[PDB]
Symmetry: D3
């Protein structure tokens, strides 16, 4: 059922929207890309938060003690991106989702 | 950016919920699982629709004359699964999404 | 029960918001109206989609071979309106919905 | 922009779902029709509440003094229907929306 | 289940909090984000206020307090004005209105 | 804008309120409606608790209170158990957990 792919696609969409904000400076487009970035950001946050609450059971946290702070930093990096036009912040959020994805599949093997 | 993975994952939750409905008889669980199935089914229907309306542009409908119908047959297979406890109806929906995933990537490479 | 009135009313909010964007220059209002236009546009797109997936059954697609495309052209006309301040793009979307409303009722009588 | 047609279609859907609950007694269908009835009911309530807050301006209330309690009774009748399997409660909610619709069009003339 | 205007107050306190942050800044991005947040939080403030009126407040509450109907409407309208404005004063007018509904709320929990 | 666990508490108080109404009744319709409401309100309780953890609580709050991370996870999981159960005791376990996060919340508003 669970997959971090839903967090990736929404966060891949945040960076995509940020790259497009650089090559167009029209007020209407800027506003629209801010409305979509806020929605896609909160959705990415939800999917990451769900992985932490509903999937990762108590023995997983005893196995990877840094997981708790990682999920928090992932959510926080995504909130920074939600507030930024810089694609690097969206990529920081993607790099943070990749770390969770690595740990996620290491619990399916 | 789009990816039919969003539809598949939500459709995979439907078949998984249908299967959990056969190993438990408790009225409260049957009720909860029905609510969840109704939620993920309409979410899967949303993701399939969005692909069709926002991703798939006119050159794709000319290259794939069957695409229009494949999407409608998926949305209806998923509506069937939404009102069925049978894991097969959910597996039928997943198989239609698999046909959309194949066409999707053939338009991403070249 | 279904009715394309739900799509038309939300699409009518889009054209009305586009028109209000031409008589005011205030940055805050342009911003608010853009947010609202993005909201009602996707709501209109939802109502058009739901007609196509849940109401329109296979005998309708055989009777109207152009229905599949009419719905996709509406969803795209509405996506154009969503990213345009031009009242015409919103009126183009309303005109496509009007073609869906005509076909809708022809299948309700007989 | 505003139209009570959105409240009608959702409340016409509540009565429709209640009629179908009478001709089928299978636990799965009953649960599904309860999930759809709860959603369609809250949506009907929202559209009626919006007509009252966003459309009807202060001179309209000075013109029809019974409007305030009508909108409340409409919302309450719809909450009774949300809780009932009886189609008559859904029709009571529809009859109450018809009264608002009558007053609505009498403000457009 | 359980109702409380504290839900309406917090989403309405968010509208004023956003309007105060819009005064010291000028950045096209920050201004836009605040408007998106103000539109959503004001619409949520309007939902909670409407819920108390329909779902919580029963018919005798309308006889005992005849002013309640017009008060809830003026709160919802004040919250629409706050949604449309950038001025913290219109956001505070809605908090003043919610405070009045809050006073009537706890009076009925005593009844 | 402004955060408060009172949002999490009320949606979590609704879960227990629903579970108590499920005990005295047996009606197939009333039982179903309560389950739909319990699923929605518990999922909303889980949202607010998650929001406080990511959006409100900053990094020094995690150093000062090292137990916070596991507490929020156990609250979210306790709320998942309440969502799955009909017993008011599991709905109260989540209120006990939220009460602990509430204590830590007001301590940081003093800091």
């Amino acid at each position: 059922v669970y997959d971090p792919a839903q967090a990736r696609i929404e966060a891949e969409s945040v960076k995509a929207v940020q790259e497009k904000m650089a090559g167009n400076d029209d007020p209407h487009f800027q506003t629209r890309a801010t409305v979509i970035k806020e929605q896609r950001a909160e959705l990415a946050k939800h999917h990451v938060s769900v992985l932490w609450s509903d999937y990762f059971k108590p023995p997983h946290f005893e196995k990877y003690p840094e997981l708790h702070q990682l999920v928090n930093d992932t959510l926080k990096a995504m909130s920074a991106a939600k507030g930024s036009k810089d694609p690097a912040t969206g990529q920081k959020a993607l790099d943070y989702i990749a770390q969770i994805d690595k740990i996620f599949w290491e619990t399916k093997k």
